[PDB]
Curated annotation (Swiss-Prot), chain A:
Effect of residue 131 to A: Abolished binding to -Gly-Leu-Asp-Arg C-degron at the C-terminus
Compartment annotation: Cytoplasm; Nucleus
TPR repeats: 344-377
Superkingdom per UniProt: Eukaryota
Protein name (Swiss-Prot/TrEMBL): Protein fem-1 homolog B
Binding site for Zn(2+) 1: 185
Residues annotated as binding Zn(2+): 186
Swiss-Prot record, chain C:
Encoding gene (name): CCDC89
Origin superkingdom: Eukaryota
The organism's taxonomic lineage, starting at the top: Eukaryota, Metazoa, Chordata, Craniata, Vertebrata
Shown part of the complete sequence: 352 to 374 of 374
Subunit field text: Interacts with HEY1.
UniProt record similarity statement: Belongs to the CCDC89 family.
Protein's cellular compartments: Cytoplasm; Nucleus
Organism: Homo sapiens (Human)
Protein name: Coiled-coil domain-containing protein 89
Curated annotation (Swiss-Prot), chain D:
Annotated family: Belongs to the Elongin B family.
Protein name per UniProt: Elongin-B
Portion of the parent chain present: 2 to 100 of 118
Keywords, in A-Z order: Acetylation, Host-virus interaction, Nucleus, Phosphoprotein, Transcription, Transcription regulation, Ubl conjugation pathway
GO molecular function terms noted in the UniProt entry: transcription corepressor binding; ubiquitin protein ligase binding
Keyword Magnesium (UniProt): no
The organism's place on the tree of life at top rank: Eukaryota
Species for this entry: Homo sapiens (Human)
Quaternary data: Heterotrimer of an A (ELOA, ELOA2 or ELOA3P), ELOB and ELOC subunit. The elongin BC complex interacts with EPOP; leading to recruit the elongin BC complex to Polycomb group (PcG) target genes, thereby restricting excessive activity of the PRC2/EED-EZH2 complex. (Microbial infection) Following infection by HIV-1 virus, component of a cullin-5-RING E3 ubiquitin-protein ligase complex (ECS complex) hijacked by the HIV-1 Vif protein.
Curated annotation (Swiss-Prot), chain F:
Tissue: Widely expressed. Highly expressed in testis. Weakly expressed in other tissues.
Parent-protein start and end of this portion: 472 to 627 of 627
Family designation: Belongs to the fem-1 family.
Protein name: Protein fem-1 homolog B
Organism: Homo sapiens (Human)
Residue ranges that the Swiss-Prot or TrEMBL entry lists as coiled coil: none
């Protein structure tokens, strides 16, 4: 039966030993196997009673289940971790991931498969080393556990222990014939993961254990990320390794100072200057064997400097915080190239700290340059675009003039990203389709915020005209929300969300100016969503019809000035007057109609179910479909 | 100022000027080189609209100009099943 | 809250890293 | 949609809340206003102490008796318990 | 974020900022050299209007903020016969 | 503005504004009827910009607002009616001032379109509510209020 399986699973999860021996007593041979192994979908996870007793750490319940009822150890299930979803794992994997020694011992003594793998080739040894319990990993290794075999993603226990703060498990792994040269998809070896974590003792012991400094598939070295994550204790030991290169030495403690110059976690000036000066002295002592820098031409947004070639400009920027930070950013971009996504974050942080004390222009140009750099890399810039609309809303609220080309370029980037999101969700899988659509909706909302910003600006004729063509292109690629809400429907809706930043002080919906701008750029005014509503059906439902009356009024006439049909019936056959829910909107729409014998004839055709196919003009077919 | 609407069957449908200027294309026909400001005939010829449809169109003209400002539950315009789908093309060709 | 406080570092790569880190 | 009137000896706070809201929310906005800890503040609905847990929908603060036109007077006292000492307003002058 | 209204008897009448700013002279006194850009008290002292009339003024502030855009079945604001001719003077002093 | 300062009145108390907003103003039928259409938004806006008194009353007490709200063509001529109401309110008019029969402009508004146009233009004021209470309760306001408030209650 299915009813008792739920109670058995509940008792196993709670681990009440006084309930297991009562619920599982006097059970037939078939039922004792049917109940133990039943799929219970709780909290979004498929939890076998055995695996849910192993995960909760009920050693007594697990021992009673294994010793008496003799449940198989090959049963699979799904356990929801902190951001980790694993299906197909056994009870040994669940016990190792939860870190309970007694359940692991009982399962292994009862015959649990230590070499059993999940869908992504994941062993319980990785689960045991995830929380770094030395007893469990020692017991598993002593029970024929293989460390050379990694998961589906070429990720064994070694780097899992490298990220985690536990050192006993990684030392035990390195003391049992472990190969630290295993490479991930992008050529990432164990030293890359150890340096990214930047644990001093792990990277110190890895030097003695054949660190094997090699270049991964990005043309990127473990020392680069060791010095990139703002840690000034790993680079010295990486140099202490006997195979350090001079060029790698040149990049080290120089990119480290660059990262220290611009980072929220490690923002300081004296440290940055000290490492920059020592890295400069590392090459500025030979003379006859000098290593002159190869510096790219300066960027107009990157000030007007070409890094430091002499010690005089190095010591001249000792008291200049902005100059030293900007040199650090420049050299970080030079060494890391223009492809790394992480180079935008220091620029964003510098712009944010420049904007937090009421100065905007340098922040504006830094965020614009970061937007350009991420546009080259083809990344999901939705959050950055959101914050960028936020900073425009703030600076408009503080009444400072707005650069029209900035709006121009951000709108063209927005429409390009919207098209990218369209093709992506067209070719997306069903697993991440919901978050892809959420990102698309955020892009739509930030596009509307930017359009409202543009309406709030006194752009010249050319700027506003090219904004009109770009918006024209956006509607001509037909962006539709998952509920059918086109751009006009979101522009005329008060239910369109606005984030908690300065946008709500400037960009509010419904907006008369945004609606008029959308109607200017060839928007489909009579667009119909899944519920059958149109822009008129949405604007008539406005809940503030007096205080914002003018805006509401304007929007209605704009729709009437753009061919919105006032007799259109939605999927429930409700004209916008039937959806008014307001006297003000009702009478505004009544005064904005015409008698329109076409509407009466179309209503007569629809109500009488006359087959209007090919016997009326082509436009009259959709006209009748309106009613 | 009393225009004459002639259907496809020769049925004259003489109606008032402001009644017949509700339709856009009748206004267009009476405009341009169709004025003849002599208040003599103001004749417009409908080679396509049948008489049983032009009659309903003229009744619509009168009904609209009477009930254009009421907004107090105006009576429904009686459109027969057979007149519809032929009154629709007339209301399209004669805009509004 | 300000611009710096709500600045959250790029975690899509961190999300990209952790799917390879599923134990 | 409930509107009420927190009363000190002389201080008078005007409060908006929800019908399906508990005492905790209004005690927290009195926190934000009068800056006194919540254990030593307690309400008095018609001189009757109310517990800090029940919602105001069934406590007696329906929208049809605590309308914003005449919000329901709600007493309050602070630890120096302390009795209700709500000072009435000035007596209006008689009709001239 | 609140405005402290003090009547002629000393009755504090702490009300919302946006609720108090619906009247012209409260906005005027909160403007000029009276801004109090610290949002903890923002006190306004009235040595003229008694407590019973400023109470109804604050009640009206809440009442108009709640019903600012209803326009359907607007409920009456209860003006006592004795409090009239004096709430009128307060509403003339506090423009709207 | 010179004529407005002269302050003309017809036999029935109509000022220039009341005639400019009345649809019953007799326009000449020879050629002016094809151009001059009363009520007209532009003439009222020009008069108000020329300092026309807005709260003037007839012998029946109707102001310009009481006259415009009774407009018989609020749908086919909505722009004129809306502009008249906007100009009258913005130039300063009492949306609830009473005539001799104690009828507010909302009461006189035969068409609901004008009712809700005025309601969108109407702003709630405690002075108007208190004046309405004073008039309804017939409490003696002589010398008890400022001189302006006396007439304010007088037309509420």
């Amino acid at each position: 039966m299915e009813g008792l399986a739920g109670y058995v699973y509940k008792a196993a999860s709670e681990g009440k030993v006084l309930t297991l021996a009562a619920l599982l007593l006097n059970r037939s041979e078939s039922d004792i196997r049917y109940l133990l192994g039943y799929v219970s979908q709780q909290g979004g996870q498929r939890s076998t009673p055995l695996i849910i007793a192993a995960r909760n750490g009920h050693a007594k319940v697990v021992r009673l289940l294994l010793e008496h009822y003799r449940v198989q150890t090959q049963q699979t299930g799904t356990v929801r971790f902190d951001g980790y979803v694993i299906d197909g794992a056994t009870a040994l994997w669940c016990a190792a991931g939860a870190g309970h020694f007694e359940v692991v011992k009982l399962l292994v003594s009862h015959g649990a498969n230590v070499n059993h793998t999940t869908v992504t080739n994941s062993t319980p040894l990785r689960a045991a080393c995830f929380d770094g319990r030395l007893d469990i990993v020692k017991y598993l290794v002593e029970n024929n556990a293989n460390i050379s075999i990694a998961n589906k993603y070429d990720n064994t226990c070694l780097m899992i222990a490298a990220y985690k703060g536990h050192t006993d498990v990684v030392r035990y792994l390195l003391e049992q014939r472990a190969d630290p040269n295993a490479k991930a998809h992008c050529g990432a070896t164990a030293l890359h993961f150890a340096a990214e974590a930047g644990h001093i003792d792990i990277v110190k012991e890895l030097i003695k254990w054949r660190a094997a400094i090699v270049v991964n598939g990005h043309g990127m070295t473990p020392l680069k990320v060791a010095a990139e994550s703002c840690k000034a204790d790993v680079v010295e030991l990486l140099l202490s390794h006997a195979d350090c290169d001079r060029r790698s030495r040149i990049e080290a403690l120089e990119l480290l100072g660059a990262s220290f110059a611009n980072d929220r976690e490690n923002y300081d000036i004296i440290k940055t200057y000290h490492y920059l000066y020592l890295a400069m002295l590392e090459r500025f002592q030979d003379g006859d064997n000098i290593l002159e820098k190869e510096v790219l031409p300066p960027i107009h947004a990157y000030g007007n400097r070409t890094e430091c070639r002499n010690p005089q400009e190095l010591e001249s920027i000792r008291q200049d915080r902005d100059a030293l930070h900007m040199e650090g950013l420049i050299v970080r971009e030079r060494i890391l190239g223009a492809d790394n996504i992480d180079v935008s974050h220091p620029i964003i942080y510098r712009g944010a700290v420049y904007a937090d004390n009421m100065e905007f222009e340098q922040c504006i140009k830094l965020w614009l340059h970061a937007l350009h750099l991420r546009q080259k890399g083809n990344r999901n810039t939705h959050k950055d675009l959101l914050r960028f609309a936020q900073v425009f809303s703030q600076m408009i609220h503080l009444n400072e003039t707005v650069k029209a080309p900035d709006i121009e370029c951000v709108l063209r980037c927005s429409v390009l990203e919207i098209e990218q999101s369209m093709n992506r969700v067209k070719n997306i899988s069903d697993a991440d389709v919901h978050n892809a659509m959420d990102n698309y909706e955020c892009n739509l909302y930030t596009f509307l915020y930017l359009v409202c910003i543009s309406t709030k600006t006194q752009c010249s004729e050319e700027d506003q005209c090219k904004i009109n063509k770009q918006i024209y292109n956006l509607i001509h690629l037909d962006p539709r929300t998952r509920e059918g809400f086109t751009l006009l429907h979101l522009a005329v809706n008060s239910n369109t969300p606005v984030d908690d930043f300065h946008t709500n002080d400037v960009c509010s919906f419904p907006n008369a100016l945004v609606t008029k701008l959308l109607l200017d750029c060839g928007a489909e005014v009579n667009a119909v969503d899944n519920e059958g509503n149109s822009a008129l059906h949405i604007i008539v439902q406005y809940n503030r019809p007096i205080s914002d009356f003018l805006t509401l009024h304007s929007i209605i006439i704009s729709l009437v000035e753009a061919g919105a049909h006032t007799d259109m019936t939605n999927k429930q056959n409700k004209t916008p007057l039937d959806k008014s829910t307001t006297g003000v909107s009702e009478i505004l729409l009544k005064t904005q109609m015409k008698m329109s014998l076409k509407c009466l004839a179309a209503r007569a055709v629809r109500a009488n179910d006359i087959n209007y196919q090919d016997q009326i003009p082509r436009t009259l077919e959709e006209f009748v479909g309106f009613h | 100022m009393y225009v004459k609407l002639i259907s496809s069957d020769g049925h004259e449908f003489i109606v008032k000027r402001e009644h017949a200027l509700t339709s856009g294309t009748i206004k267009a026909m009476l405009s341009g080189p169709g004025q003849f400001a002599e208040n003599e005939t103001n004749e417009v010829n409908f080679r396509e609209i049948p008489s049983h449809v032009l009659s309903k169109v003229c009744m619509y003209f009168t009904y609209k100009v009477r009930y254009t400002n009421s907004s107090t539950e105006i009576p429904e315009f009686p459109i027969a099943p057979e007149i519809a789908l032929e009154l629709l093309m007339a209301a399209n060709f004669l805009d509004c | 809250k300000k611009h710096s406080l709500d600045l959250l570092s790029k975690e899509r790569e961190l999300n990209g890293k952790l799917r390879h880190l599923s134990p | 949609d409930v509107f009420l009137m927190i009363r000190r000896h002389k201080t008078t706070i005007f409060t908006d809340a929800k019908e399906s809201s508990t005492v905790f929310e209004l005690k927290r906005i009195v926190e934000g206003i009068l800056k006194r800890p919540p254990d030593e503040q307690r309400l008095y609905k018609d001189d009757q102490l109310l517990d800090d847990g029940k919602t105001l929908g069934e406590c007696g603060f329906t929208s049809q008796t605590a309308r914003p036109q005449a919000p329901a007077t709600v007493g309050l006292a602070f630890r120096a318990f302390e009795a209700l000492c709500i000072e009435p307003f000035s007596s209006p002058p008689e009709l001239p």
